[PDB]
Ligand binder design. Sequence first.
Ligand SMILES: Cc1cn([C@H]2C[C@H](OP(=O)(O)O)[C@@H](COP(=O)(O)O)O2)c(=O)[nH]c1=O
Ligand SMILES: [Ca+2]
Length: 136
Amino acid sequence: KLHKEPATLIKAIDGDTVKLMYKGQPMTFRLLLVDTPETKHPKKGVEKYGPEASAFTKKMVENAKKIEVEFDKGQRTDKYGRGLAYIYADGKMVNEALVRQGLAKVAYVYKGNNTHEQHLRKSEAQAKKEKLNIWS
Ligand SMILES: Cc1cn([C@H]2C[C@H](OP(=O)(O)O)[C@@H](COP(=O)(O)O)O2)c(=O)[nH]c1=O
Ligand SMILES: [Ca+2]
């Protein structure tokens, strides 16, 4: 079983990337198992719902009393040095909130980091059934 560790928000970067102070050092975290539309890469442009996904995450972590990070059992950092985790705001998983709202798709089931994959997939099916945002 995984365990949550406290962290402090530094800054929300976009829908799936946030900077947190973790174990006293600043670190960029990438949300496990999700993909929010891009808003900074010239390759994709400013994809549809990018701005909305960014606003959602930002609102969620900024308004939180408590932020927690939960590493999975596989690799803890990507090739860019970003921590790969499930992030919680007042006990609510940001990763799931995004999928449930149709603001992210379940993606990158990578290097044994899939503990909450089923949980996420269920939320995604529900957002799809409801034709929300990305699925509209
Ligand atoms: C979520 C996640 C993303 N990534 C990588 C894959 C992609 O690399 P490439 O940049 O080579 O495509 C990129 C997707 O993140 P972004 O959605 O921030 O771009 O980060 C991982 O390596 N592991 C992961 O668990
Ligand atoms: Ca993304």
